[PDB]
Amino acid sequence: IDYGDVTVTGGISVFDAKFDELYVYDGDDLGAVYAPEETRFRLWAPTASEAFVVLYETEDGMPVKELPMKRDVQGTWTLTVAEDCGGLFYTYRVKVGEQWNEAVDPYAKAVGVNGTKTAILDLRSTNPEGWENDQKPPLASPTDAVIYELHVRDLSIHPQSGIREKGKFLGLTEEGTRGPNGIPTGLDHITGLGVTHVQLLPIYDYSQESVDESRLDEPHYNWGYDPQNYNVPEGSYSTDPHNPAARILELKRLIQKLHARGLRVIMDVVYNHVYDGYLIHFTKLVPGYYLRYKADRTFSDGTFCGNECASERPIMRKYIIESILHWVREYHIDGFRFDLMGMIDIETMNEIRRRLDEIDPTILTIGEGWMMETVLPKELRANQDNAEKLPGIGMFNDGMRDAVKGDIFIFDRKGFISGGDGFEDGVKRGVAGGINYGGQLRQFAVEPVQSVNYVECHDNHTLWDKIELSTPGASDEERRAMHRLASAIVLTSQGIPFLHAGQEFMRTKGGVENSYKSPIEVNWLDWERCAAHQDDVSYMRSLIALRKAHPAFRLKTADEIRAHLRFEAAPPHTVAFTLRDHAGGDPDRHLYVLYNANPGALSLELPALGPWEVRFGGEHVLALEAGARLEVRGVGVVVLAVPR
């Protein structure tokens, strides 16, 4: 690999610390700006000796023009083509050292099939009718969101989904779709749940080796965590990957429809690594800059995906931020979930949060704040240890996850719901939003908006499958009750509740622990199973409604939680708490919540706060008597209230 002739850049190597400050482009116009009169190109490539715009008439054709660019300011190259380039494709050809490379524009906003050429297009021809009038469903606080994590192919590819455009963005725009026994499916199923945000697994353009966009007439599946073009949609989710405008219009139609039906959209984004550090446009155009290196000038591989993006270098920080803002401004996206956020530096994350706040503070930022080794210094990683430096950014609460359903790696290990011993405090830490509540009840969050509660996601075994691995002597009914209890804990805890699509019908992957490239038979939303679980779907719907009806479950600040949340007297394998004195403006004076993981009957003394009434789980109540006494039986949640 040739990193360039350093005489081009004042003798400074691309690895040298002084490189960053020499070539920081201050303009917002990297990429190509098309108009019928002319197209303007700007490419950042400080180490190149030569740069060309290569024009193509067809995605797979030969060049029709090969035009040298002019060296410009702050490491950029420019070129104006004073012709109507509409419908053409282009690449950049550069010479770095003795090596020649041809690459897609890193600022590509449209591509041909499989993302190997940039498409020149009038962007506003891709907008749906009335796109400028698109209005977001209201959202007051992040703790008022209920997130539903969904893969575009999973949603509709089951053969009984009743959805026309199976596997596609458009498949999630279809209302009225019906499945086995006539149940609602697709969009109608999701809106019927009452969730507020759909978090979509990678919808940016991922690699051909993951899904080949020219082979969609045979089996295909991938989560898509292999980024290729950060600023354009994935082609396999469009009706026609060969038409550059189709995937853009169809994604916008999807976001437009979801907004009209009361739903916001969160994008799963993967700025921590690329699909191939050797082949990506970054390395072809400016080798050694955009990715992290170890001391021997090989890739740092903290991702375990082959490479890491050097988010901390200013041009890559700029790249990530301008990418996020493109998705906000062009696609009206409502939030971002940062894959392996602990690989991204704190300054970059806080600048992202600031630039989003300037546009719309209700836009969500959550991420995987795992502690992970990388050449990025420890005190600069955007992870749980450093959460006090990352205000307003949510992090998946793995401590809560493990306390509720048991250990994620030792498969037969029980947790709170399955009768394990000593998991009560871990559940309590999550009920409090992961904040510094007091005593032993403390996690990484300063404020509850920093804690995302979940017992299932696309990673690791589903909740149902983990239960099946850890309850050898349990019946199916007993396992269903444990599953329901876990869901109720997520939806009655402080912080941001997060559900995995299909968790409402006890989604199984047949024991597959990491299904990233498993076939659709493993990964689809099984609408047959959904039709067999309509009671469990109604139960999830009623928990979501319960949380919506009670602002006390959604306290915005740690101070309010410390003032109004109190844990109550309880035996082992149970957790009991109150939310007192119209917490968060709740309509009821007090709430009492019982998480019962004991299959037997039991009796509790209630706090002497007034005349308790049932609000939820009345099916579990053997007696409620005004000391005040509650008797219950069975694994499940009960909620009481003292009326105003």
Residues that bind Ca ion (CB under 5 A): 205, 235
522's contact among Cl ion, Ca ion, none, with CB below 5 to 8 A by partner kind, is: none
Nearer to Cl ion (CB atom), residue 286 or residue 531: 531
Record the tokens describing residue 42, joined without a space: 């700007």
Name the segment binding Cl ion (CB under 5 A); options: 67-75, 358-366, 512-520, 528-536: 528-536
Is residue 251 classed as helix, strand or coil in its secondary structure?
helix
Nearer to Cl ion (CB atom), residue 532 or residue 545: 532
If one asks whether residue 534 binds Cl ion (CB under 5 A), the answer comes out as no
Classify residue 597 by its DSSP letter.
-
Residues 595 and 573 sit within 8 Å (Cβ to Cβ): no
If one asks whether residue 532 binds Cl ion (CB under 5 A), the answer comes out as yes
Record the tokens describing residue 507, joined without a space: 């989604």
User: Distance between CA 297 and CA 291 in Å, rounded?
Assistant: 11
Nearer to Ca ion (CB atom), residue 235 or residue 342: 235
Nearer to Ca ion (CB atom), residue 235 or residue 430: 235
433's contact among Cl ion, Ca ion, none, with CB below 5 to 8 A by partner kind, is: none
Residues 32 and 118 sit within 8 Å (Cβ to Cβ): yes
602's contact among Cl ion, Ca ion, none, with CB below 5 to 8 A by partner kind, is: none
Name the segment binding Cl ion (CB under 5 A); options: 121-129, 377-385, 526-534, 610-618: 526-534
Strand order in the sheet with 621-625: 601-605, 629-633, 621-625
Beta bridge partners of 530: none
Question: Closest residue to Ca ion, Cβ-based?
Answer: 205
Is residue 520 classed as helix, strand or coil in its secondary structure?
helix
Nearer to Cl ion (CB atom), residue 80 or residue 160: 160
Written as one letter, the residue type at 556 is K
Nearest distance from C-beta of residue 103 to Ca ion, angstroms: 16
Q: What does each C-alpha distance from 619 to 382, 480, 623, 629, 639 come to in angstroms?
A: 44, 15, 11, 16, 11
496's contact among Ca ion, Cl ion, none, with CB below 5 to 8 A by partner kind, is: none
Q: Is 446 exposed, middle or buried (0-12, 13-18, 19+ CB in 10 A)?
A: middle
Nearest distance from C-beta of residue 158 to Cl ion, angstroms: 14
Nearest distance from C-beta of residue 616 to Cl ion, angstroms: 27
The candidate with the shortest Cα–Cα distance to 360, out of 194, 191, 109, 142, is 142
Q: Is 598 exposed, middle or buried (0-12, 13-18, 19+ CB in 10 A)?
A: middle
Nearer to Cl ion (CB atom), residue 179 or residue 244: 179
What is the residue-wise DSSP string for 301-365?
-TTSSS--B-TTSHHHHHHHHHHHHHHHHHH---EEEETTGGGSBHHHHHHHHHHHHHH-TTSEE
Nearest distance from C-beta of residue 532 to Cl ion, angstroms: 4
Nearest distance from C-beta of residue 206 to Ca ion, angstroms: 5
Written as one letter, the residue type at 58 is T
Residue 38 annotated as catalytic: no
From the candidates 149, 250, 368, 465, give the one annotated as an active-site residue: 368
Residues 177 and 191 sit within 8 Å (Cβ to Cβ): no
Residue 364, φ and ψ in degrees, nearest 5: -90, 145
From the candidates 250, 339, 504, 586, give the one annotated as an active-site residue: 339
Q: Where is the binding site for Ca(2+), in residues? A: 205-206, 213, 234, 468
| Binding pattern for the stretch 103-142 against Cl ion, x by CB under 5 A and - elsewhere | ----------------------------------------
Nearest distance from C-beta of residue 398 to Cl ion, angstroms: 35
Q: Where is the binding site, in residues? A: 205-206, 213, 234, 468
Residue 368 annotated as catalytic: yes
Question: Closest residue to Cl ion, Cβ-based?
Answer: 532
Nearer to Cl ion (CB atom), residue 160 or residue 239: 160
| Binding pattern for the stretch 448-467 against Cl ion, x by CB under 5 A and - elsewhere | --------------------
User: Distance between CA 258 and CA 253 in Å, rounded?
Assistant: 9
Neighbours of 112 (CB within 10 A): 21
Name the segment binding Cl ion (CB under 5 A); options: 184-192, 296-304, 527-535, 551-559: 527-535
Nearest distance from C-beta of residue 182 to Cl ion, angstroms: 11
532's contact among Ca ion, Cl ion, none, with CB below 5 to 8 A by partner kind, is: Cl ion
What's the angle, vertex CA 54, arms to CA 52 and CA 57, rounded to 5?
Answer: 165
User: Distance between CA 484 and CA 490 in Å, rounded?
Assistant: 10
Residues 558-597 that bind Cl ion (CB under 5 A): none
The candidate with the shortest Cα–Cα distance to 418, out of 459, 456, 468, is 468
205's contact among Ca ion, Cl ion, none, with CB below 5 to 8 A by partner kind, is: Ca ion
Residues that bind Cl ion (CB under 5 A): 531-532
Q: List, by residue number, the catalytic residues.
A: 339, 368
